[PDB]
RNA sequence: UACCUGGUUGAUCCUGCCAGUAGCAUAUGCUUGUCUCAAAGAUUAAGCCAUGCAUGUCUAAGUACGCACGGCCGGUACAGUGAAACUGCGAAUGGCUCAUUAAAUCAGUUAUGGUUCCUUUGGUCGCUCGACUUGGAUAACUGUGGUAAUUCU
RNA sequence: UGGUGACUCUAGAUAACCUCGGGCCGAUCGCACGCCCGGCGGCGACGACCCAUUCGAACGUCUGCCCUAUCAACUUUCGAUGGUAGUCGCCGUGCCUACCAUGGUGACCACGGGUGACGGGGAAUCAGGGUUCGAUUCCGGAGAGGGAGCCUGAGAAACGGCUACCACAUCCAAGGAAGGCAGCAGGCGCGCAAAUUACCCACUCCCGACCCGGGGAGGUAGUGACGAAAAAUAACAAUACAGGACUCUUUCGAGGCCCUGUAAUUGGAAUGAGUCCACUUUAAAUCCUUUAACGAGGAUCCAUUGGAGGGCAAGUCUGGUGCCAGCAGCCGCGGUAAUUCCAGCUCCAAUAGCGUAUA
RNA sequence: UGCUCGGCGCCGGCCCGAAGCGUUUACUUUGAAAAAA
């Protein structure tokens, strides 16, 4: 081609979108934003599928442009605004709030939250930078540039940032024994405790994280998020709590739910 | 670029030897007591049974106490007992290999209608199924090649809009009554 | 004779409207037109029958149960605000201009054959 | 479903081939009630095209002295709608085809610590030590012309 | 100060430079209106050097591509190989200049030629092992007759942008103007071979100053026996009669209630195709479904295709020509008693499908 | 397979953990990375 692509095919989108196959030949291509193309969730698909508030592409424009939506405490007007991991969705007229977190599988899930919980946002540092006059600069996962942070913030540290102001409130150091979140890949959306990390020079570092049920796995360093200091999470967990519960006992619990329902 | 499905598969299959005596005699026989239209229906049934026996063959190829084998086998025997071709006591993994075409054709809707005593003959059962006279859990069914589940077996009854089980008389009895009252005076 | 039961009732209050899924139960008769469906739905929800926009009615095999959608607003101006135009045309609230898109295409071409205020009179 | 059958001889065993058997997708022929999907100028011609269409765009927030409409007490400018035109935006997307191309393209994996990036997001934007608003050019418009004609001037 | 596995990294300090074809340090516009004593205030929109981020693009590293020896040596200072110094390029590099040495690849198949070669994700066949195709909706690459060159713009060597060539080709008062359907429909040419000069932005997305406009992107309809899926062409009752199912008469005879089967004997029960009202669907219809009024006794509301010696399920049936006409994928059937030719009857195979030729 | 820093433990001392290193290959086994259909 001679330039950037402005179109997205319906089957070209990855699986975590969870779309259909006959209702359209085109998919909603998200606009440029803080997050990458593969891991994102636009407003249009979330509103017209997860909540089913709008049934039409004109209807989702009517539900969006009337300034009833809050993203990181700010009102937006884009229909293809990329809202990825650990983002807050607030609706003032309805009265409920949502936070964008992964499910136990490779997809996003809805999560109703209390409003007083919707005042801070966890962020993961990408790099530590120095400004033009010795000013320390910080880059989060949503590219939120923060000036003058704490000196105990490193490359792979996680911080708590207030939504209404944008200042550093709390932070968690990266060491073994902390509760962990995994974002990205086939092994995605799970809760565990970091126990072992080895270092590879010039390669991708792999960490070893033990599950609370004793399950063992290993993922890359770039797909590691910290959501708690030790064993207590700072964020309220959804139903399922990231165990990667195995197939035969979703079969067993589905038969149990069917016999209990009658 | 269109929003099309483009997915299909053949349901029947043709044998290698077209002209023969024996297998022709058994398929003509089973059409004889089961009342089938043509050879393509039993070709579809044979293809489905060959698929499920092939799937059982690579299921039994894998070793014992394997998770996906156990899960696929439990799901397959649960499907086979819920369609009614097996019985609830004999749940074993290799008894799928010991069933034939008559077990598949027993759960046909025509056989259930004929053995339930609401039809005279199997041909009468076929023409009455094709004429939409049966409600199955309050649902009008037309297709004769219908698989009846074990739990959906006691709900077979005449449809409420049929004149046989109670309802308005059709075109012909109304015509006979009209010509009778016309000729009466 | 003909009854309506509510299903999947949800109140999206920000749109000043409520959504619900319509099934129509009627034994041994034709497909029911939407007028008395709207009247009975409005009588069920204690509303006058003017803010209802039902669409998409399909008939099952047998006709004992026909599915559909159900829609209610709170005011006529809000129904005029966020609604598809063809539903208003079915209800007789909005009318469109009757020329085809081909005639508009050659019309726009005939304006772009000139420049300036000649576009105002070359295309009548 | 891990399959054969007829054919050299006066008759018998073998190499061996021919021909039947089943599917796949192209044309054609015969024939034809219902209904759900659904391919379709690719193989010769990436040969030639008459015609009609396929890219346009305004909110409260860039320019409004077109009475083209239109509100009054009109006088310390502009109520409002507004064709047209100036201005920035995209026109490098999408659609069709396989003519070239044989470590070329492409697939998996890697690096740019050897470079760029419209727009969006976040920050930077009194960090420098020396006017209570500056200037002239062009539209649209009016009027005047040549061409056989153009989205000509 | 801070970081990488690693900087000639970022930051810090010093001396200057700082391009008139010229880096920033707001001479822009709307909304609600105000406090204090002329100054002082919020919510925005637009623009803006610098970064990181986002869509990416670009050159690279390792591994994997059809056939051919009637392709055995190939490339070289008209750069082939690398070193030094530069030019250009957004950077890295013979990408290219000036000087150097003769280098680099090959039997593990280079070099050369052909390909009925766009590649892959895939499709058919498939015990296992394999063979063939992939133009084709997903991804990436190439071009818009073929080369060449260029403006604008962040991003184009763009062709529904421009310039010159040849080939084709439109109009003309003859001086000159105007061209690229391998886009949507449609025409010519070609061939065994391939559809309407239709409706609409309503659904899915895309562009724009932007809820509001536009989009042959697409959706809808028709042509459509490419192919796939479901699925009409009747059954019960009594009479046409060979006797079995069980007991008996040496055998016929009888008990015979399920009888089983077939004849244009009769009888009622019915539903569809179609004719159409309504309703539904839809931008509006058509399609499907529901429902009125109709609508079958040779249900004339009439089912074809190749065959009947063997392979290979099906008449030594009848009549006609009698090495001629012909049949026959192969054996072989025709010379005056044709189980194969040509016609009528019956029968077998699949069934709205069947046969033939090319791979 | 062992020789500079610190840990579950106890009164200059034992054990454990660890900065650092402790023959290359194929194969075997477990993980990540691995577009959708």
Coordinates of C-alpha atoms (C1' of nucleotides) in Angstrom, one line a residue, chain D:
Chain D
rU1 C1' -14.6 -50.0 4.0
rA2 C1' -6.5 -51.1 4.2
rC3 C1' -11.3 -54.3 -2.0
rC4 C1' -10.7 -55.8 -7.4
rU5 C1' -12.7 -57.7 -12.4
rG6 C1' -12.3 -59.2 -18.3
rG7 C1' -8.6 -59.5 -22.2
rU8 C1' -2.1 -63.2 -25.4
rU9 C1' -3.2 -70.1 -24.9
rG10 C1' -5.5 -76.3 -28.0
rA11 C1' -5.8 -75.9 -22.5
rU12 C1' -2.2 -74.2 -17.4
rC13 C1' 0.9 -70.9 -14.1
rC14 C1' 3.7 -65.6 -14.3
rU15 C1' 6.1 -60.4 -15.9
rG16 C1' 3.3 -56.9 -18.2
rC17 C1' -0.1 -53.3 -20.4
rC18 C1' -5.1 -52.2 -22.0
rA19 C1' -10.2 -51.6 -20.4
rG20 C1' -14.1 -51.5 -16.7
rU21 C1' -15.2 -49.3 -10.8
rA22 C1' -15.6 -44.6 -7.1
rG23 C1' -14.8 -39.2 -6.2
rC24 C1' -13.2 -34.4 -7.4
rA25 C1' -14.3 -29.7 -11.0
rU26 C1' -15.1 -27.5 -16.5
rA27 C1' -18.1 -27.8 -20.8
rU28 C1' -22.3 -29.9 -23.1
rG29 C1' -26.8 -32.9 -23.8
rC30 C1' -31.6 -35.0 -22.1
rU31 C1' -35.2 -33.9 -18.3
rU32 C1' -37.6 -31.0 -14.3
rG33 C1' -43.0 -29.8 -8.8
rU34 C1' -41.6 -27.2 -3.4
rC35 C1' -37.9 -24.9 -0.4
rU36 C1' -32.8 -23.0 2.3
rC37 C1' -28.0 -21.5 1.0
rA38 C1' -24.9 -20.2 -3.0
rA39 C1' -20.2 -19.8 -7.3
rA40 C1' -20.4 -17.0 -11.6
rG41 C1' -15.5 -13.2 -18.4
rA42 C1' -9.8 -17.1 -14.5
rU43 C1' -7.8 -20.4 -18.1
rU44 C1' -7.8 -18.3 -25.2
rA45 C1' -7.5 -11.6 -25.0
rA46 C1' -3.4 -7.8 -18.6
rG47 C1' -7.4 -7.1 -26.2
rC48 C1' -10.5 -2.7 -27.5
rC49 C1' -14.5 0.3 -25.0
rA50 C1' -20.1 3.9 -26.8
rU51 C1' -22.7 5.2 -22.6
rG52 C1' -24.7 6.4 -16.8
rC53 C1' -22.5 6.0 -12.0
rA54 C1' -18.3 5.2 -8.6
rU55 C1' -15.3 11.3 -3.1
rG56 C1' -17.1 14.5 -0.8
rU57 C1' -17.5 17.6 3.6
rC58 C1' -20.4 22.8 8.9
rU59 C1' -21.0 22.9 14.5
rA60 C1' -22.1 27.1 19.6
rA61 C1' -16.9 27.6 18.5
rG62 C1' -12.2 30.1 10.4
rU63 C1' -14.0 34.0 6.7
rA64 C1' -21.9 36.4 5.6
rC65 C1' -22.6 44.1 2.8
rG66 C1' -26.1 37.4 -2.4
rC67 C1' -32.7 41.4 0.5
rA68 C1' -32.1 34.4 -1.6
rC69 C1' -35.3 34.5 2.8
rG70 C1' -36.3 37.0 7.2
rG71 C1' -37.3 39.4 13.2
rC72 C1' -37.7 45.7 15.2
rC73 C1' -37.8 50.5 18.8
rG74 C1' -33.7 49.8 14.1
rG75 C1' -29.5 54.2 13.9
rU76 C1' -23.3 54.0 19.4
rA77 C1' -21.7 47.5 13.4
rC78 C1' -23.3 42.4 13.1
rA79 C1' -31.4 38.9 15.3
rG80 C1' -31.2 34.4 12.9
rU81 C1' -31.3 30.8 8.1
rG82 C1' -28.2 31.2 4.4
rA83 C1' -26.8 29.5 -2.0
rA84 C1' -22.0 31.0 -3.9
rA85 C1' -16.7 31.7 -3.0
rC86 C1' -11.9 32.0 0.0
rU87 C1' -9.6 28.5 3.9
rG88 C1' -7.8 23.6 6.2
rC89 C1' -9.0 18.5 6.0
rG90 C1' -9.1 13.3 2.9
rA91 C1' -8.7 12.2 -2.2
rA92 C1' -1.6 7.6 -1.0
rU93 C1' -8.3 4.5 1.6
rG94 C1' -11.6 1.0 -0.6
rG95 C1' -12.5 -2.2 -5.4
rC96 C1' -10.6 -5.5 -9.8
rU97 C1' -6.7 -8.8 -11.9
rC98 C1' -2.4 -12.3 -11.7
rA99 C1' 0.8 -9.9 -16.7
rU100 C1' 6.0 -9.9 -14.4
rU101 C1' 9.0 -12.2 -10.4
rA102 C1' 12.5 -19.1 -8.8
rA103 C1' 16.3 -17.3 -2.0
rA104 C1' 12.9 -12.8 -5.7
rU105 C1' 8.0 -12.6 -3.1
rC106 C1' 6.1 -15.0 1.2
rA107 C1' 5.9 -18.0 6.1
rG108 C1' 7.9 -18.5 11.4
rU109 C1' 11.7 -15.9 14.5
rU110 C1' 14.5 -11.7 15.3
rA111 C1' 17.0 -6.1 15.5
rU112 C1' 16.9 -0.7 14.2
rG113 C1' 21.9 0.8 20.4
rG114 C1' 21.4 2.3 12.2
rU115 C1' 15.9 6.2 10.7
rU116 C1' 11.0 8.4 10.0
rC117 C1' 5.9 8.8 11.4
rC118 C1' -0.5 12.5 9.7
rU119 C1' -3.8 12.0 13.7
rU120 C1' -5.1 10.5 19.0
rU121 C1' -3.3 10.3 24.3
rG122 C1' 0.0 12.7 28.4
rG123 C1' 3.5 16.5 29.4
rU124 C1' 6.1 20.9 27.8
rC125 C1' 4.1 25.9 26.1
rG126 C1' 5.9 34.4 32.2
rC127 C1' 12.1 28.9 32.4
rU128 C1' 15.5 33.5 27.6
rC129 C1' 17.1 40.2 30.4
rG130 C1' 16.4 42.9 25.3
rA131 C1' -0.1 46.5 21.9
rC132 C1' -7.3 48.5 24.1
rU133 C1' -4.7 45.1 17.8
rU134 C1' 0.2 46.5 12.5
rG135 C1' 0.3 46.3 6.4
rG136 C1' -1.6 45.4 1.3
rA137 C1' -3.3 41.5 -2.3
rU138 C1' -7.4 38.3 -4.0
rA139 C1' -12.3 35.9 -4.0
rA140 C1' -17.6 35.6 -4.3
rC141 C1' -20.3 39.8 -6.6
rU142 C1' -21.3 43.8 -10.6
rG143 C1' -20.2 45.0 -15.5
rU144 C1' -17.6 44.1 -20.1
rG145 C1' -15.7 39.9 -24.4
rG146 C1' -13.0 35.7 -28.3
rU147 C1' -13.4 30.6 -29.3
rA148 C1' -16.2 24.7 -32.3
rA149 C1' -16.0 22.9 -27.4
rU150 C1' -14.4 21.3 -22.4
rU151 C1' -14.7 21.2 -14.7
rC152 C1' -11.4 26.9 -20.9
rU153 C1' -10.5 32.1 -19.5

